[PDB]
Amino acid sequence: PRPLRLPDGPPCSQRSKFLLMDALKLSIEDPGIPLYDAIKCMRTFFGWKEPNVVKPHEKGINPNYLLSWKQVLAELQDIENEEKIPRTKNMKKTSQLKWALGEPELRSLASWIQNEFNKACELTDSSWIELDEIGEDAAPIEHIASMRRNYFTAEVSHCRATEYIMKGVYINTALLNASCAAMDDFQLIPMISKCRTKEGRRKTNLYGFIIKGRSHLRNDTDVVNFVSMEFSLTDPRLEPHKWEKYCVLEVGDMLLRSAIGHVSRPMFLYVRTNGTSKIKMKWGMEMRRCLLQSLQQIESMIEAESSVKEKDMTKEFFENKSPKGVEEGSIGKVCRTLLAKSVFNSLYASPQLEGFSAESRKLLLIVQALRDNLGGLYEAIEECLINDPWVLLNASWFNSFLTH
C-alpha cells in the first residue's frame, strides 16, 4: 500500500573504493610491470603544477594529504634515477603517511548515484574483456550456450560497468598480493586497467595510486588501511556533498578536445583514507562473476520465451525479431542494465543492501499478488534505508514500481 519512507537529511556521499564516473585515465598506447607502466603513464602528461587543496576534507588533516601526494611525486622521481626501475616501491614512513594510514546518521538520496548508474550502463569506445572472458567451463560449451555467450559479450565488452569490473579486479588483486608480499611496508600501488581500442590497439591506463598501510592480516575480517589518490576532471565544488570523505587537490591542467575546439581544464586529485579486508579483496577479485551472473539472468529470459514457443529463441531474442519491443530501448541496453545492477551490488555491497534486497522481494511478491487479484515487513525494509546511496536509489526505484 504505502510508498517506502525514505530518510531525510543531508545528501548522501560517495563511498566506493575507487572513483566511478569521475575517474580520469592517463594512458599509453601499444605498451608489463605496474610501476613501470605507471611512470610511463605519468610521463605522458606535461600539465602538472604545484598542487594545492581546493576541497578540504572537513574531518581530516588536509596538509597531510597534500604532503602525501607531493611525496608520491618525489618518490616516483627517485625511481626515475635508480638504475633499473624496480618491481615495487616502498614509501618512506613519513609522518603524513603514518597519520593517513592510521598508525544514525540519516542521509537523503542525492541525484548523483542515479547518474553514476546511468553512466555505468553506457558504452565506452574500448573493449575491456576478451571474447572468451565469461565462463569457467572445464569442457567445450554446447552450441547454444556458446551463441548466447557471444551475443552477450558483444553487448557488454565495451560497457563502462565492465571497465569497473576489471579496474576493481586489478586493484583488489594488487592490494591483496601486496598485503602478504609486503606486510610491513607502505607500498605504492598503481591503479591500472587495460583495454583495446576499436582499431585493436592495446592501451594501458593509470587512474591513480593507492598506498597501503601495515597489513598483518591474520583473518578474513582483518582490515588493511590505504590512501587512494585518484585523477579526475570533476570539479568537487559543483557537488560538495558527494565528496564528504575526500580531500581534493588541484594538481595540473589538461588540454582537451571537446565539442568546442581545444580547451584547457584543471586536473584534480581525489584523496581519501579507506580500508578493506581479505574477504572483501577476494570478492573484489571475483567481480568477473558479475558478467556470468547477468548473462545467466539473460539466459533465463531466453529459456522462458523458448519453452513458450517450443523452439530455441536465442537468435530471435538478441536480434529482436510474444513481445513487440524492448522497454529499455534495445537488447543491448537490457544486458548492460543487468550488468550494471550486478556490478553496483558488488561495488556498493553492504548489510543494508542485503536487508533491503530480501525484505523488498517479499513486499514485491505480495504486492503483485494483490495487483493481479484485486506494517511488519515495512519496518524490516526501512530499517535498511539509512544513508547508503545504492540502497536509497534502489528504494527510490521500488517506489516507482509501487506507483506503476
Give the residue with the Cβ less far from Cl ion, 39 or 295: 295
Q: Which is nearer to ligand 6AV, 7 or 51 (CB)?
A: 51
Residue 69 CB, nearest approach to ligand 6AV (Å): 9
Residue 21: contacted member of ligand 6AV, Cl ion, none (CB under 5 to 8 Å, by partner type): none
280 binds Cl ion (CB under 5 A): no
Interaction partner, residue 42 (ligand 6AV, Cl ion, none; CB < 5-8 Å by kind): ligand 6AV
Q: Looking at beta carbons only, is 39 or 91 nearer to ligand 6AV? A: 39
* 210 contact, one of Cl ion, ligand 6AV, none, CB 5-8 Å limit per kind: none
- Identify which of residues 127 and 204 has a Cβ nearer to ligand 6AV in the complex: 204
Q: Please work out, in degrees rounded to the nearest 5, the angle formed at the alpha carbon of residue 371 by the alpha carbons of 369 and 376.
A: 60
Shortest Å distance, C-beta 76 to ligand 6AV: 4
Q: Are 291 and 129 in contact (CB under 8 A)?
A: yes
Cβ nearer to ligand 6AV, comparing 75 with 239: 75
Q: Which stretch binds Cl ion (CB under 5 A): 42-50, 96-104, 288-296, 366-374?
A: 288-296
Beta bridge partners of 257: 262
Residue 67 host element (H or E)? helix 62-79
Residue 161: exposed, middle, or buried by beta-carbon count in 10 A (0-12, 13-18, 19+)? buried
Q: Which does residue 288 bind out of Cl ion, ligand 6AV, none, counting CB within 5 to 8 angstroms by kind?
A: Cl ion
List b or e across 15-32, with b for residues whose CB sees 16 or more CB atoms inside 10 angstroms: bebbbbbbbbbbbbeeee
Binding site for ligand 6AV (CB under 6 A): 39, 42-43, 48, 73, 76-77
Handedness of CA 283, 288, 294, 299 (dihedral sign): negative
User: At a CB cut-off of 8 Å and minimum separation 6, what does 276 contact?
Assistant: 17, 172, 175, 223, 224, 226, 284
C-alpha cell at 36: 613501470
Q: Of 25, 160, 242, 288, which one interacts with Cl ion (CB under 5 A)? A: 288
Q: Strand 223-232 to strand 202-212: parallel, antiparallel, or no bridges (unpaired)? A: antiparallel
Nearer to Cl ion, 137 or 220 (CB): 137
Closer of 288 and 336 to Cl ion (Cβ): 288
Q: Which residue has the cell 583495446?
A: 196
Among Cl ion, ligand 6AV, none, residue 401 binds (CB under 5-8 Å by kind): none
Q: Which does 367 bind (CB under 5 to 8 A by kind): Cl ion, ligand 6AV, none?
A: none
Candidates 80-88, 276-284, 291-299, 391-399 — which segment interacts with Cl ion by CB under 5 A?
A: 291-299
**Pure H helices in 157-204:** 160-181
Nearest to 158 by CA among 132, 212, 121, 188: 121
Positions touching Cl ion (CB under 5 A) are 288, 292
